[model samples]
Target: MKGTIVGTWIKTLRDLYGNDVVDESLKSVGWEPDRVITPLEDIDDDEVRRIFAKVSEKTGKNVNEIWREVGRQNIKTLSEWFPSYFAGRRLVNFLMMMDEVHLQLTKMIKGATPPRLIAKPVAKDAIEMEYVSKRKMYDYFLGLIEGSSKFFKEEISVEEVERGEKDGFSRLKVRIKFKNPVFEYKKN
Candidate 1:
């Protein structure tokens, strides 16, 4: 299971059973009651299934219900680490959309960098979001973002506001501005 999966699971458990159930479950597993799952690391299938089973047993919830809540919980990890993803849609909705595709991709790759994403309003009626990568990832970053949107079925108008090689750190700067307020990025 990726950190995102576990992170999302924790959130899902909380949403379905409330913080009390999640806190107790975390403690049951010897995690700090307030233990934050940091990065959503990838965990294997058997382990993920086992975690869900434990939750179901303890909370008396069905597996599907448990899974749905887990999915819901999983979505918000990005916003917690990077609020720029919210772009002002409130926490739940923001995470829901983000998680939908983020985990989907996480399952496919191991050791991939979640693109560094940032966003803000660029116009009174327009939203501008920026997706960036460490100077070295200029090209890889673009490919991942395009592929991500394709997976999520989102049609975006992406414009390259800036991209180039910068001198000091031998860095590549790749900047993208979007025509909408919403976008998805996976950073792990």
Candidate 2:
């Protein structure tokens, strides 16, 4: 994960829980919770998982729920930091373009291994999105979807089709249905 995103997560976690809660969790994972993470630095995913596990045990909250909440909150911070990704776009466009946006951003990092988000229109008011990754953060993925809808102020119905590891990749397939048609039909 990018240190910047991790930094945001740490800050958000502190805000949601408290300094002591997050600090103790980080300490368990051999990290100084107060240490500032540089934007471009990379951190191990396992380290994040361990820290979250500690936080979960301490708070009695499900680790999945924690990841989901973090993901939801992260979307807002992400928009603030990466404004261009959210600017001048409706909900559908924003969601659809994210795959390419993710590619560009992760590609810039030397050892980035972020998940692949692939989206395609299924109908006038729906799209099928497949999330492929080795980490299998399905809860976090769903949370991000909810967060995107919330941030865009759009209503959506999210249906999960499948979520499991396949062919060495953890996958999440979901169908997202919008309240209204986002794309117009054109005849050639």
Candidate 3:
């Protein structure tokens, strides 16, 4: 994983769980608590998992719970780091553009395998989005969607349509129903 995302995770952990948990977790993984992560630095995926596991042990929170919480709070860090992605965009717009954003951001990074977030309008007030990745961070993905809704002050109902593994990729499809109509029929 790239340091940009992992670094955001570190900040999110501190913001959500406080510095002691994060500091201890990092030290458990043989990392300096105050270590700086360059945006382009590459971090071993296993190392990330070990740190999170240590956090789970210290906080008594399951890994999935921690990830979901991180995902929910990580938006704040992301907004501070990259404001343009959220500026002038509604929740639906932000969700729809996520795939392109992921691709664009990871394109230049060597060996980067960004997740696929393909969303399509399914109704006037609903969208169906597919999350495909080898990492299978489903809880985190759902948390991010929830965070987006909260950030945009939009209420949403999410229904999991499918979840499984296919062709060595974990896939999750969800239908998000919004409170207000975001699209309309046009007679063009």
Candidate 4:
């Protein structure tokens, strides 16, 4: 996992719960309360898992929910950090471009293992997004989608079509329908 993800998680955790709660949780995990995570740093995945687990233990919140909410909050934080991705882009465009963005990020940074986000346009107003990764962050994926919709101020309906793990790879297929058609044909 990248330190950016962990760092953003900690910041957003504080934003959601407050500094003392996050501080205590980090201390419980043997982590410094105000540690700074560089974007290029590669952190252990299990370390992140432990931090979240500690937060969950203290707050009595489900770990899955914690990840999902973190994912949701992270979207806004990311968009704020990188304005070019969201500027003048609609919901569908943003979602469709995520796969490419992930690829570019991995290429730009070493040891960055972003998820494989594949989104295909199934209709003028719908898309089928398939998330494939070793990390089974299903709730996180859903939360990101929800956050994207909220960010764009566009209503969307998401239906999960399939979910399972095989050969150490987890897959989630979801069909997202937009409130308005993204592309329209006209007869001149």
Candidate 5:
């Protein structure tokens, strides 16, 4: 699916359900959903067209509206995820804090397929997050860390950046750290 359209699905969830419950869902999955991609940089016009075509069937809204609606609703989601990257805050803060950054990231492209981030559990006081995107927007991931640390009033270190290409898709892995042990990643 298109990144913007995927973003819209997130928006729809919020619209259908209250923010509190949706924020709770975000707590489980972080800002990005379980199997969706961020649709800003890598998706081409043709692919986006196909993705939006399916989105249109689901929502009965046109692709342009889907994109605009996704952009319009992004601020509500991304702002919450920032805090977890620092200070050992609960996943609630992370999702509550993501609205603005998500807006900034989504505004960069109209028809682009943004990257989907799966922030997994790694070790004590750590998160093993992987960003799957064809564009390899490493800077965006770094920006999220910076924004998170600032929001949560915590100092952190990012170690061992591992990147590779598989099946023509670019993937990045990162680990973030905090000063105290109030937070930890849960094992699967």
Candidate 6:
């Protein structure tokens, strides 16, 4: 994973779990408490797991819960860091562009395997999004969607259509229904 995302996770961890937990978890992974994670730096996936596992052990909260919380709160940090992505964009548009954003952000990095977020408009007020990744961070995916809705003040209903593993990749399909129609017919 890129340090940019992992770095956001650390900040989110501090916000959600407290500084002590973040510091201790980093220490458990042989890192200094205040270690700086530079953007564009590559971080080992296993190291992330170990730090989160240590967080779970110390906090008595399941790792999945931690991920979900981070997914929800990470948006705030991301918005602060990358304002342009959120600026002047509605919730639906933001959701729709996430795949492209992921690809564009990681394209320059060698061996960067960002998850595939394929979203298609299914109705005027809904979209079906497929999440494909080797990591299978489904909870985080759902949490991100939820967080987006919250940030945009848009209510939505998320229905899981499918979830399983195939060809060494974990896949999750969800239909997200919005509170209002996001599309309009153009009279030309």
Q: Sorted by lDDT, highest first, which candidate order results? A: 3, 6, 2, 4, 5, 1
Q: For all candidates, what are the clash counts?
A: 16, 0, 0, 0, 24, 0
lDDT per residue for candidate 5 within 1-188, as digits (tens), equals 34544454455545644455444454443343333555542444454345445555555666555554544344334544332333465533463334444445666556644565766445556666666777654554555555456555667677747888768778877787666664554565
Off by over 4 Å in 6: 184-188
Give per-residue CA lDDT, model 2, range 1-188, as digits (tens).
87867887887788677899999998898888687787778888889899899889988999999989988877887788778888898889898887887677678786677789999888989999999988889888898899899999999999999888899999999999999987667785
Residue range 1-188, candidate 6, lDDT tens digits: 88888988898899998999999999998999998897758889999999999999999999999889889999988999889999999899999899999999899987878999999888888899999999999889988988998998989999999999989999999999998898765675
> Which ten-residue region of model 3 has the weakest summed lDDT?
35-44
The collision pairs in model 3 are none
Of the candidates numbered 3 and 5, which has the greater lDDT value?
Answer: 3
Better of 5 and 6 by TM-score: 6
Q: In candidate 3, what are the lDDT values of residues 1-188, reduced to their tens digit?
A: 88888999999989988899999989888889998787768899899999899888888999999999988888888889899999999899999999999998789986779999999888999999999999999988988988888888999999999999999999999999999899888886
Q: RMSD per prediction, one decimal? A: 13.5, 1.7, 1.3, 2.5, 14.3, 1.6
lDDT of every predicted structure (CA atoms): 0.50, 0.87, 0.91, 0.85, 0.53, 0.91
What does candidate 1's lDDT look like per residue over 1-188, in tens digits? 35653665566567657787667666665667786564535545565455556777887887666554444343344345455555555422432354345545555675654443444444432344444443333433344445334434455455656654445222333333334554444464
- The TM-score of candidate 1 is 0.39
Model 3: residues with Cα > 4 Å off, grouped in runs: 186-188
TM-score of each: 0.39, 0.92, 0.96, 0.91, 0.43, 0.96
Q: What is the lDDT of candidate 5?
A: 0.53
